[PDB]
Design a protein around this ligand. Structure first.
Ligand SMILES: Nc1ncnc2c1ncn2[C@@H]1O[C@H](COP(=O)(O)OP(=O)(O)OP(O)(O)=S)[C@@H](O)[C@H]1O
Ligand SMILES: Nc1ncnc2c1ncn2[C@@H]1O[C@H](COP(=O)(O)OP(=O)(O)O)[C@@H](O)[C@H]1O
Lengths: 340, 8, 340
C-alpha cells in the first residue's frame, strides 16, 4: 500500500477529483495501519478512521469504489440501502450484507474482517401505519459502525450455529448524492447581505454553486437533513467532490476505452462505413453537457440528439465511405458533411 | 402495507 | 459502587474547565443509582427521582459529559434531538420513538433499561411562541413521560405481544443552549443597561464571560424565555457551563488522554517515526475556532486539512524520524519542517 501509487491507478479511471483522491489514500492507509500493528499504543481510544463521500450526480462515486476493489487485494461489497427493510421484513435485512461480504471472501473470517464496505443512496434513509425504510435503518446500521459482534449462520444454517465475526475492524464508506444539501449550507455561509454603498452585494451566483460549498460543511448541517448525530459522529472524515470540469469531458471521450465515441464507431464499422470526430466538436459538446447539470451520465443525450438525422438517413444513403462531424453539426444549423 | 398519514 | 470523588477524576480526565458541572452530575448520578440498588426495601417507599437540566453555550462539552459517563458507568445511553419532535400526531414526529431508541442499545432489556440514561438536544427550540405544534404543546406531552410511566414496546420489532418498561427509574438530562438569556437575567438581577450612555455597553463580548451571570439563573427567568414552570419543576437540578477558553483549547489537546494531538502521535509510533506539536501552533487553532463560532466541534476540519499533505506523503518519504509543525503552516503560507 502506497498513497503515491494508489492515486496513480485511480487517475487512469477517474478524472476531475484530485483532492478527494488524497483523502481516500490517507483514510484507507490509516485503516489498515491500525489493524496490522495498531491498538498497541500508549494512548487509548484511537479514533476509527472512516470515509463519508458527498457529491452530485454522475460524480463517479461508483467508479471510485469499483476502481478501489479491483486494485485492492481484499474483497469489496456494493450494498445500497434502497431496499434495506429492518426487523427481517419481506424486502431484505441488514444481516444479508454481512453474508455477501463472506461470499466475496469465501468464508474467511480472518480475511473478511479486513474488508471494505460501501453504500450508495444513503439520502433515502433520512428520517421523515408504519415506516420500514425510514429512520429504522439508521438504528441497525449504527450498531454496525460503533462496533459490535453479530451472528451470521454459516452456509445459511443446515444446530443453530452462528459466526461471531467482529465488525469494528471493517471499514465503511457511506456515500450518496444529498439533494437539497445546498440551501441549508447557504443560510449559514451567506450571513445576509448589505444594502448600503460600502457593503458588497452578491450576484446571481458567485459562491452558491455546488463547488466550494461542501468543503465548508459541518456535522450540524447534516442533522437538519434528517440523519442521526450519533451516525455522523462515527465518521469525522468527509470527502467533497467537484461537479465536473470542461477539460475532463474531452478526456473521458478519448482516453477511456469505453468512451461514447468509440462505442458508436464500432456500431458503424460493422456496416462498412467509417466515423470521425474532430477536436472542435468535442469541446463544443462539453459546454452543452455542463448546462444540463446531469454529469457524464447525461452525455449520450447530446450525441444521439445530433446523430439522429445522420443515422436515420445513413442506410438509404450509398457510396458514403466516411462521415465527418464539424463543429456546426453540434449546433444543428448545418448538417454533417459526407465523404464519398 | 399502506400508510395514510395526513395532518391538517 | 463508585463515589463522587472517583467519578470526578474520571470526568476531569476527559472534560475540563467545568468544575461546578462535575459536582452536580456526580452527586446526582450517585444518589440516582443508590436508589436503584436499595430499591424501596427501607421504610421510605416510592423514592422520588431527581432530573437534570443543563444550560450552556454550544460546543461546550455538554454531550461529552453524558458520553464519557456512559463509558465508565457502562449503562446504555442514547442521544435524542427535540428539533424534529412534533405535537402528538403531526408529520414531523411523535414522542413514542424516543422510548424504543433506549432499548435499541441492547434490544433486550427488562430489568436493565430502567437504569439507563437519556440526553436531549436543542430544548430551547420548543419555546412557547407567543404571537401550536412547535411551541408549548410539545412540552405538555413530555410531562407525563419524565414523571414515570410505561409504554408498550415491541422487542426487536418481531409474537402478538408487547413489553412494558418503567420510566420513573430512567433519569433524563435535557441538554441545550439558551441564547439571548443574558438580557432577561441582566435586567432582573445585575442591571438594566446596554443601550444608554451611563448604562454599561456590551463591550465584553469575549473579554469577560457571560457564564457568571448564568450562575445566578433561577426558574422564574426561564418562564419568560418560554418554558412552562410545570415543566421546569420536574427538573430541579441545574448545571451551568461558563464558557470555553483559548488556553483551555490548548489544554484540551494536551491534558485529555484522548486528545487529537495524541492520536496522531500514537499513529506514527508503530511506524517508527516521532511526532511533535509546538505551543506556537495550538494557539492559532483557537483563533480559527472562535472565528467560525463553532467551538471545539469545528477542530478536526482545521487539523485534518493541514496534515493532508504530510500524511499522504509520509509513507512515500523515507528516513524521516521527526515532524515539526509551525504557526505559519496552520495559516497555509508555509510547509511543515521535516527532520531526517
Ligand atoms: N469520474 C469519472 N470519470 C470518467 N467517467 C465517469 C466519471 N464519473 C462518471 N463517469 C461516466 O458516467 C458513467 C456513470 O457514472 P457513475 O459513477 O455511475 O455516476 P454516479 O453519480 O456514481 O451514479 P449515482 O449517483 O451513484 S446512482 C460511467 O460509466 C462513466 O462512463
Ligand atoms: N473538555 C473537552 N475536551 C475534549 N473535547 C471537548 C471538550 N469539550 C467539548 N469537546 C468537544 O465538543 C464536542 C461535543 O460538543 P457538544 O457538547 O455536543 O455541544 P453542545 O454543548 O452544543 O451539545 C465533542 O466532539 C468534543 O470533542
Amino acid at each position: 500500500p502506497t498513497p503515491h501509487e494508489i492515486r496513480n491507478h485511480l487517475d487512469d479511471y477517474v478524472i476531475g477529483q484530485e483532492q478527494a483522491k488524497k483523502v481516500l489514500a490517507v483514510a484507507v492507509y490509516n485503516h489498515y495501519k491500525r489493524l496490522r500493528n495498531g491498538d498497541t499504543s500508549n494512548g487509548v481510544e484511537l479514533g476509527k478512521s472512516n470515509i463519508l463521500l458527498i457529491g452530485p450526480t454522475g460524480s463517479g462515486k461508483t467508479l471510485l469504489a469499483e476502481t478501489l476493489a479491483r486494485l485492492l487485494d481484499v474483497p469489496f461489497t456494493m450494498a445500497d440501502a434502497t431496499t434495506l427493510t429492518e426487523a427481517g421484513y419481506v424486502g431484505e435485512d441488514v444481516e444479508n450484507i454481512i453474508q455477501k461480504l463472506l461470499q466475496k471472501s469465501d468464508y474467511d473470517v480472518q480475511k473478511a474482517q479486513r474488508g471494505i464496505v460501501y453504500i450508495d443512496q444513503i439520502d433515502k434513509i433520512s428520517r421523515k401505519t408504519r415506516d420500514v425504510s425510514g429512520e429504522g435503518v439508521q438504528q441497525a446500521l449504527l450498531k454496525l459502525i460503533e462496533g459490535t459482534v453479530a451472528a451470521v449462520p454459516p452456509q445459511g444454517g443446515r444446530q443453530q450455529e452462528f459466526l461471531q465475526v467482529d465488525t469494528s475492524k471493517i471499514l465503511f464508506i457511506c456515500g450518496g448524492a444529498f439533494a437539497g444539501l445546498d440551501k441549508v449550507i447557504s443560510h449559514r455561509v451567506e450571513t445576509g447581505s448589505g444594502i448600503g454603498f460600502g457593503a458588497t452585494v452578491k450576484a446571481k451566483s458567485d459562491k452558491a454553486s455546488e463547488g466550494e460549498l461542501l468543503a465548508q460543511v459541518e456535522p450540524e448541517d447534516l442533522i437538519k437533513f434528517g440523519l442521526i448525530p450519533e451516525f455522523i459522529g462515527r465518521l469525522p472524515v468527509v470527502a467533497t467532490l467537484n461537479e465536473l470540469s470542461e477539460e475532463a469531458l474531452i478526456q473521458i471521450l478519448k482516453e477511456p476505452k469505453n468512451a461514447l465515441t468509440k462505442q458508436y464507431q464500432a456500431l458503424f464499422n460493422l456496416e462498412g462505413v467509417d466515423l470521425e470526430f474532430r477536436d472542435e466538436a468535442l469541446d463544443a459538446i462539453a459546454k452543452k453537457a455542463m448546462a444540463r447539470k446531469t454529469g457524464a451520465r447525461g452525455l449520450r443525450s447530446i450525441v444521439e440528439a445530433a446523430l439522429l438525422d445522420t443515422m436515420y438517413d445513413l442506410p438509404s444513403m450509398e457510396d458514403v465511405e466516411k462521415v465527418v462531424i464539424d463543429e456546426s453539426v453540434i449546433d444543428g444549423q448545418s448538417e454533417p458533411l459526407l465523404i464519398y | 402495507x399502506x400508510x395514510x398519514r395526513x395532518x391538517x
